[PDB]
Fold this sequence. Notes:
The structure is a homodimer.
Chain A: E1 6-12, H1 16-27, E2 32-36, E3 48-49, E4 58-59, H2 60-73, E5 78-80, E6 83-87, E7 90-94, E8 99-107, E9 112-113, E10 129-130, H3 133-136, E11 144-148, H4 152-164, E12 167-171, H5 181-188, E13 193-196, E14 199-206, E15 210-217, E16 223-227, E17 230-233, E18 237-238, H6 241-246, E19 270-272, H7 286-306
Parallel strand pairs in A: 1-2, 1-8, 2-5, 8-19, 10-17, 11-12, 11-17, 12-13
Antiparallel strand pairs in A: 3-4, 6-7, 7-8, 9-18, 14-15, 15-16
PDB class: oxidoreductase
Keywords: Redox protein, nucleotide binding, FAD, Flavoprotein
Assembly: dimeric
Amino acid sequence: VKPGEKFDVIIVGLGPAAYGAALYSARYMLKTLVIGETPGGQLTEAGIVDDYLGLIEIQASDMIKVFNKHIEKYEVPVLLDIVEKIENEFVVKTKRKGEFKADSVILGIGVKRRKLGVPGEQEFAGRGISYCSVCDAPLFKNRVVAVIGGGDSALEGAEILSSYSTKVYLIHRRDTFKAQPIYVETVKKKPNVEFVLNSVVKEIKGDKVVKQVVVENLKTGEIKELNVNGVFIEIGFDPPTDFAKSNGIETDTNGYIKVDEWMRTSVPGVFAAGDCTSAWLGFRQVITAVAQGAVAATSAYRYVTEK
Amino acid sequence: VKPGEKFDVIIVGLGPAAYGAALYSARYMLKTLVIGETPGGQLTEAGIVDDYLGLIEIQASDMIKVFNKHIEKYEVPVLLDIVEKIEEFVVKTKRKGEFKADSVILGIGVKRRKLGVPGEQEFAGRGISYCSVCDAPLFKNRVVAVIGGGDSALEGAEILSSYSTKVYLIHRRDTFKAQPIYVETVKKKPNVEFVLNSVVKEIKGDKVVKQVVVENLKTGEIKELNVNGVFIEIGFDPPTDFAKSNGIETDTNGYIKVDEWMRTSVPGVFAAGDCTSAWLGFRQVITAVAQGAVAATSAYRYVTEK
């Protein structure tokens, strides 16, 4: 593909939602272009994925490879770059590869995970550290684990891990949690979840795999070394509010791109799917992102053919 | 399992939505039982599936096997039988007794309206299809017929016009009942031919479909059209009788009414897939499986908070 080329649809992103949208877009015979920064999106940080029906215990890197193969079967051009602006046909401007034209746009830009950044985090990646509790909980049956964070992701994470794991240490830097009351009350009733409030993780330690987390109480300055086999980092996600505003796309009060049932945004001709949207907000899974991508491609098809 | 045994969740049905709900329910460590009549649901009548991301050109029967393998990896017990009533909840089956549950997930789908003409059953999988969005790519440069007059028929003719050399759109009434926007859009296609006030009398061929015999109900004329494929898009029967029999609210089209989180009108009963009011008109394996995950999540939230 070359700058100035026109497409029926341009899909922004390269995570599950974008692959899902590209497969349906191409099969509708829509001239499709995918422009995304990182192939696989957040799957680049996952280990084994066993929650996508039909792909049993697949390495996340192999899921990304087969998702790409599926869209390439239909010769969908994929450009690795960042989309900086979407102007209204639509002109999509990228950072390094120029501008492209499109009759419709599908946003599958997801959300950025809020980073922790402590020593041992990168060294133990794939060896005890996980960024998804619901995804990996079955893997820590009868292991002691720690969950870091205090929003819904963290509390729901501690709730499912408490069912599987020996014990969960729920560590959060504030005095109270910010998750929904119903989640805090449910977790509070688990005898094997211990709240470690007013604390931060100083380091994650181990040999071949994770074995301990060093925690500091911000109020007393006291240090604790907890013996754990897994550390689940669940501090949250930042939605693409600035990108949306910059491009005149409405966001809900949570900062997510607002869509209706059919994945339509506030801008006619612009649809969205996956983690970046207000649909099924808080449930972030490959299966739902791929399905939303199919729906957004279907709404883009109806839009383009009718235009 | 044994009659009278209790579960956190009982899943009714064994199509893609049920398998999707089962995977997530089991992964939420919920004690789960699936009771469905036919393994695979409508997938038993599908050919090759190439629209479910990650499973490239998979035979419908093979998708049924890997979906079953996946939930059996979590040791989910599966009973093959009919659920007769949903009275905690008491789920009464036809031959395996009653079972109790804290929540229920309905993945009962809908039945395809049948045409019932000679050659139909004989040529299934040999030129006959019931899903245009699914099989259109297989008919590039071929001639096809679409039978029907609703939105699925019109959109199907539109998708097929982008692949096939010629598309006959056959419908028994003087007008189509699909959205006018669909009718006007398709009309412009140079390779689509409306064949109104007509019915198909026979679908014939040799090893595969080669012709459709059509009767014009006004002009009385009987003609044969050579086609390589026949897409039957005449709709489905909603699950209304079962819904009303079980006190479940339906939408204005007779489908099980659900909210964004797949919750039905009855607290603790959720639903997923074709049988629901969600994304009505779009009936695909990927969306059914996703709705099942959402319904399982809502059931998990319900039970853990119950």
